[PDB]
Design a protein that fits this description.
This is Guanyl-specific ribonuclease T1. This protein is of the alpha+beta class and about 100 residues long. The protein contains 1 helix and 7 strands, in the order ββαβββββ. The protein binds guanosine-2'-monophosphate and calcium ion (CA).
């Protein structure tokens, strides 16, 4: 069964921790990757009720199970905070425009 389901994409806990670790390292190093400069701040415009404190950052999680290294980041993101705590897994799939919904 999937720990998070983002549309048709199925992720386990280990998928999320792996993506999160890569993103947090770049954030700590003050480095970014990709044309959209990930990781970057996640403003929470959607008003998600995350159980950890802001500020939050987002980083792509990819269904191929590879770590994001540039190119298209697809629809799915992990959202982590300054303490490297996971806030949530969110996706553009199933939401209008460039909005997000949470993966379930
Ligand atoms: N919808 C949304 N986009 C955000 C937020 N914070 C930053 N962004 C970035 O702003 C772009 C314009 O909304 C979004 O598509 C998203 O980039 P990503 O595609 O990199 O996730 C947020 O809280 N909500
Ligand atoms: Ca996997």
């Amino acid at each position: 069964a999937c720990d998070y389901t983002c549309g048709s994409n199925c992720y386990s806990s280990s998928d999320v921790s792996t993506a999160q670790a890569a993103g947090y390292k770049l954030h700590e190093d003050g480095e970014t990757v990709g044309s959209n400069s990930y990781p970057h701040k996640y403003n929470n415009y959607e008003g998600f009720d995350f159980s950890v404190s802001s500020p939050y950052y987002e980083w792509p999680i990819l269904s191929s199970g590879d770590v994001y290294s540039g190119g298209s980041p697809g629809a799915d993101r992990v959202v982590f905070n300054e303490n490297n705590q996971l806030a949530g897994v969110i996706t553009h799939t199933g939401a209008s425009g460039n909005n997000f919904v949470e993966c379930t």
